[PDB]
Amino acid sequence: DAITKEEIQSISEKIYRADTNKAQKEDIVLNSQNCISPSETRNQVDRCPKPLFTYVNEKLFSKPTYAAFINLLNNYQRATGHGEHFSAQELAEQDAFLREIMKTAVMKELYSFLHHQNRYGSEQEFVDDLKNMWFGLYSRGNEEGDSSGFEHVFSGEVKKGKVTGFHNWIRFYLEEKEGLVDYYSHIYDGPWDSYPDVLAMQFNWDGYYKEVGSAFIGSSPEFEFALYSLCFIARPGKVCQLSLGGYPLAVRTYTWDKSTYGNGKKYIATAYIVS
Ligand SMILES: [Ca+2]
Ligand SMILES: [Ca+2]
Ligand SMILES: [Ca+2]
Ligand SMILES: [Ca+2]
Ligand SMILES: [Ca+2]
């Protein structure tokens, strides 16, 4: 069944209200500090001397979907050109993440919507497709299987001396805590006055610069995984107009176009919040 623009905006609001594992107001203290003009993002000047996350209540990271998500963030080599080889325990981490997110109201809402729209006949089929499109390996650089949709969006990569991808707040917080991310500034702070919020950030990640990295702030991993999958499944390759807490938010997805899985199906090249 065709998924309409109106149907996308209804399910995106259902996903937003169902996100009970999101950070509560008291679980994160943000310090956005200096905002610069979009014309100054190539300056590479650190205008924020304090970390972006002044405090995060790390008990949030004991929630099973956060623990399973964080367990995946040490499985990759950010520099493209280095093939990825997952251990049996690392493939079990992918299954554990998918099993944990499927227990949430967020993923139950998305699967129910997609099943009603006749895109998937079963949860098993849907989980298998998600595992392929997100965790399947493809080649961005010098070696085979150095990248994936999940690595690009959630872990972040370095290609040709610049940061590429890197759109997740938990990954940002954990690297910043280790001194591996240095927050420089933002150009945009979304209309939400609660979590999830959106910030468009400039930052240095262990020697490489990210010019405009838009990220949800305070969302659970299942919220982000559901919305990015919704945009990719319903509108692959296009800008999908979501509605979140009554405010519009546009997301771009692109298919990977150098390889396929199964019967000519596409891996996710990227999913991101547009400027
Ligand atoms: Ca429909
Ligand atoms: Ca791991
Ligand atoms: Ca990699
Ligand atoms: Ca700084
Ligand atoms: Ca805001």
Side-chain angles (χ1 to χ4, degrees):
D1 289 330
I3 289 164
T4 70
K5 161 163 167 159
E6 296 76 15
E7 280 167 340
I8 287 163
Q9 297 184 150
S10 171
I11 189 55
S12 68
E13 289 287 10
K14 286 187 184 187
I15 286 159
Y16 179 97
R17 289 195 319 278
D19 197 27
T20 58
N21 297 323
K22 67 186 183 169
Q24 300 308 291
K25 177 178 168 183
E26 71 273 12
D27 292 331
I28 299 164
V29 173
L30 278 185
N31 190 18
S32 62
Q33 298 164 85
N34 278 313
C35 181
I36 70 174
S37 306
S39 56
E40 305 172 299
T41 56
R42 295 168 301 178
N43 288 16
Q44 302 202 37
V45 170
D46 185 356
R47 274 139 185 173
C48 298
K50 293 288 191 296
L52 172 59
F53 290 90
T54 119
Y55 168 73
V56 171
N57 169 20
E58 295 191 5
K59 292 181 283 309
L60 188 73
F61 301 170
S62 290
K63 292 184 169 287
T65 61
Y66 284 78
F69 176 72
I70 292 161
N71 283 342
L72 291 165
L73 304 175
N74 70 341
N75 296 4
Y76 299 94
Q77 304 157 272
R78 66 176 188 162
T80 58
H82 304 269
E84 303 294 359
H85 295 277
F86 303 125
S87 64
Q89 305 101 291
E90 285 169 343
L91 297 169
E93 286 176 338
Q94 293 178 3
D95 286 344
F97 173 67
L98 297 165
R99 184 171 64 240
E100 286 308 328
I101 66 171
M102 288 304 291
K103 297 182 196 172
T104 69
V106 162
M107 294 299 289
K108 285 172 185 295
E109 287 285 357
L110 180 61
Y111 173 72
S112 180
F113 173 77
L114 296 172
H115 181 265
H116 177 73
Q117 304 291 326
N118 300 116
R119 299 305 205 84
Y120 291 96
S122 71
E123 284 183 29
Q124 278 173 319
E125 185 199 355
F126 177 57
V127 170
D128 288 349
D129 212 34
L130 290 168
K131 189 174 164 169
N132 279 119
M133 74 183 68
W134 280 101
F135 297 111
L137 297 170
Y138 55 75
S139 189
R140 275 191 157 89
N142 275 207
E143 293 198 328
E144 209 60 20
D146 64 356
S147 195
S148 56
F150 181 89
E151 182 178 9
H152 188 76
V153 175
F154 296 101
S155 181
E157 300 180 283
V158 170
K159 179 173 165 94
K160 276 78 190 159
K162 289 279 171 172
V163 177
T164 189
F166 207 128
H167 298 295
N168 178 261
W169 78 266
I170 299 169
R171 178 60 155 170
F172 188 112
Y173 168 67
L174 291 172
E175 293 294 88
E176 181 177 60
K177 183 179 183 196
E178 291 181 39
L180 296 163
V181 153
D182 188 347
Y183 174 56
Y184 277 27
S185 53
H186 68 288
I187 64 170
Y188 168 84
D189 182 334
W192 303 273
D193 192 24
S194 63
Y195 306 121
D197 203 347
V198 169
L199 269 177
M201 309 166 295
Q202 289 64 69
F203 58 93
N204 184 281
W205 182 31
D206 194 20
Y208 298 99
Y209 184 69
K210 180 67 172 176
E211 187 184 342
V212 180
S214 291
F216 286 116
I217 305 303
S219 34
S220 70
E222 61 274 21
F223 170 86
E224 300 186 15
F225 195 86
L227 291 180
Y228 295 146
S229 298
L230 170 65
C231 295
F232 186 73
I233 291 165
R235 293 282 186 282
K238 305 202 184 293
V239 170
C240 186
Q241 294 296 323
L242 304 175
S243 178
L244 301 169
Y247 298 115
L249 192 72
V251 165
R252 167 69 77 179
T253 70
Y254 280 121
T255 56
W256 179 250
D257 295 331
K258 301 192 205 298
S259 64
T260 58
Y261 69 87
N263 181 20
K265 292 191 83 90
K266 302 284 181 170
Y267 297 117
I268 294 173
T270 190
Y272 63 90
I273 292 164
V274 308
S275 59

